Amino acid sequence: FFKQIRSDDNSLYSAQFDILLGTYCNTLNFVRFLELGLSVACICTKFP
């Protein structure tokens, strides 16, 4: 790339840019079984 210019050449005073405008997301919520109303409908136990 070789460009030579005289005393004054235009296109030395330009500005171009694409800024980001932010990033968003969501946090998933976890539900538990015993907190629901379906827990008074059965008895939960566990055998290893």
């Binding site: 800024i19 980001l20 405008l21 932010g22």
Partner: peptide, 17 residues
């Protein structure tokens, strides 16, 4: 934007429900 990643007044206005 940012470039730091290291890794009131009472106004009269009606309100309904």
């Amino acid at each position: 934007r940012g470039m730091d990643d290291v890794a009131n007044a009472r106004v009269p206005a009606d309100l309904v429900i």
